Structure 1
């Protein structure tokens, strides 16, 4: 809702920032195995629970 607590708005903001693709220079790192961000979240497909 628009009516929000500071603690909830701060939790949501951190979930916003984690929800990005990995930098593409991570790919060239020497021992890298990560291909993509496997922890991407979609606001419609899966819900935060809070």
Structure 2
């Protein structure tokens, strides 16, 4: 709401950070299956639920 608590704001920062593509060299590692992730959250699609 723009009226928000500090605790809420900290969580929003973290949520935005986890909402990023993985760098390719992570998936290029020998023995890694990080090629695609089901954790790509979008604001209209899947809600944070605080």
Q: TM-score, normalised by structure 2?
A: 0.90
Give unpaired runs (5+ residues) of structure 1.
none
The Cα of 1:36 is off from its aligned counterpart by 1.9
- After TM superposition, the runs of 4+ consecutive aligned structure 1 residues lying more than 6 A away are none
Structure having greater relative contact order (Cα 8 Å, sep ≥ 6): 2
Say which is worse superposed, 18-27 or 28-37, in terms of deviation: 28-37
Judge conservation of contact 1:19–1:40 (CA < 8 Å) in 2. Answer: yes
Q: TM-score, normalised by structure 1?
A: 0.90
Judge conservation of contact 1:21–1:36 (CA < 8 Å) in 2. Answer: no
Aligned residues: 50
Give the alignment's Cα RMSD to 1 decimal.
0.9
Give unpaired runs (5+ residues) of structure 2.
none
